[PDB]
Design a protein around this ligand. Structure first.
Ligand SMILES: CC[n+]1c(-c2ccccc2)c2cc(N)ccc2c2ccc(N)cc21
Ligand SMILES: Nc1ccc2cc3ccc(N)cc3nc2c1
Lengths: 186, 186
C-alpha cells in the first residue's frame, strides 16, 4: 500500500529511533514515495506521528476487547489490562517517542488539543472498568475520572521506566501494584 | 577542579543547547581544558553526561534530607516526596537534555548499566520511607524493595505523562494517588 506503507515505516522508525531521530527524508527513503504523497492525510510530521498514535491506541484498545473476556470480574479486568500493557506490540512501545515529541511541540497550540481525543481513548479502559465496577459494587469511587487518569499514568510509568529488567519481574511488580491500587479504593 | 569546571560548563551547555547539540569541542574550549583531559576524566560525552546526572542526584538527595524535616511521619514524607518530584521537574532545566539522552541510550548496556545504579538512588528514598514506616508501625510491608520500585515508577509516570494538565490538577492527582497507594498498604 502507499498511504499505509508510509505509516508502516513511520511507526517503526519512531520506535527504532526517536521522534526526531526519524525525519521525513528517511520515511520517503524506506517507504518510497515523492515527498508530496506525505502531504494528503499527513499535513505535517506531527500529523504523521499524531496519526500512528491513533492507529496504535486503537489496535490495542481492540486487542483488549478481544482479550478481556478472560476476566470474569472487573477487579480481574483491572489486573489483566495492566498485565497485558506489558506485552502488547501496540501503543506502549512508542511511549518514549511520545515523551520526546511532547517536549518539542508542547509549545505549539494543536499539541494540547489532539492530546484530548487521544487521552480519552487511553483512560477509557480504566473508566469503563471503574465505572462498571460501581454498578457492580466491587468498589465505590466518587471521582472516577481522577482515578482513571491516575491509574492510566501510574501503569504507563511502571510499563515504560522498567523496560530493562526481565519480563517476569515486570509482571510480578505490576500485579503487586494493581493489588495495592484496588486495595486502596475500598 | 579543572574536572569540576568541565562538569559545570557542560551542564550549562547541555541545558542551553541540549544533549545532542553540545559537542566536546565546546566543552573543552569553554572550560579551558583539552580533548585529552576530558578523555581522561570521562572518556565519552555519554559518560560526561551520566557524571553530571550523578552529581545532580546527590544535590537532590541532600535537598531532600533537609526538606523532609518538614514531614514528621513517613506517611507525610511519602506525600511530600511525591509532590516534590512533581513540582520540581516542572522547572528543572536539565530535564530536556535528560529526555533527549535517555530516549537515545536505553539500548546500549554501557549507558543501561550506570543508568541503573543511578535510578537505584532515586528508588532508595522510597526504600527508606517504607522501611522506616514499618518500624513506626505506620504500615506493614513485607516487600519493601518491591513496593519501592513500584512507587518510584508509578510516580514518574504521573509526573511524566500528565504534562498537558494545569499544575493544580496535576498536583491534585498526585496527592490523590499518594492517598490511594498509602491506603492499599493498610
Ligand atoms: C527507566 C529509566 N528512565 C527514566 C527514569 C525513571 C525512574 C527514575 C529515574 C529515571 C526517565 C525519567 C524521565 N523523567 C524521563 C524519561 C526517562 C526514561 C526514558 C527512556 C528510558 N529508556 C528510560 C527512562
Ligand atoms: N535521571 C535523573 C538523574 C538525576 C535527577 C535529578 C533531579 C533533580 C531534580 C529534579 N526535579 C529532577 C531530577 N531528575 C533526575 C533524573
Amino acid at each position: 500500500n502507499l498511504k499505509d506503507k508510509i505509516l508502516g515505516v513511520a511507526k517503526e522508525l519512531f520506535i527504532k529511533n526517536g521522534y526526531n531521530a526519524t525525519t521525513t527524508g528517511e520515511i520517503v527513503k524506506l517507504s518510497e514515495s515523492s515527498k508530496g504523497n506525505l502531504y494528503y492525510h499527513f499535513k505535517t510530521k506531527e500529523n504523521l506521528f499524531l496519526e500512528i498514535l491513533n492507529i496504535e491506541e486503537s489496535k490495542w484498545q481492540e486487542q483488549w476487547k478481544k482479550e478481556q473476556i478472560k476476566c470474569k470480574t472487573n477487579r480481574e479486568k483491572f489486573y489483566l489490562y495492566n498485565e497485558l500493557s506489558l506485552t502488547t506490540e501496540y501503543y506502549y512501545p512508542l511511549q518514549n517517542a511520545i515523551i520526546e515529541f511532547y517536549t518539542e511541540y508542547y509549545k505549539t497550540n494543536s499539541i494540547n488539543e489532539k492530546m484530548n481525543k487521544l487521552e480519552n481513548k487511553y483512560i477509557d479502559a480504566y473508566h469503563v472498568i471503574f465505572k462498571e465496577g460501581n454498578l457492580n459494587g466491587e468498589w465505590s469511587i466518587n471521582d472516577v475520572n481522577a482515578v482513571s487518569k491516575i491509574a492510566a499514568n501510574a501503569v504507563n510509568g511502571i510499563v515504560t521506566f522498567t523496560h530493562e529488567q526481565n519480563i517476569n519481574e515486570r509482571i510480578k511488580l505490576m500485579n503487586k501494584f494493581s493489588q495495592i491500587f484496588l486495595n486502596g479504593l475500598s
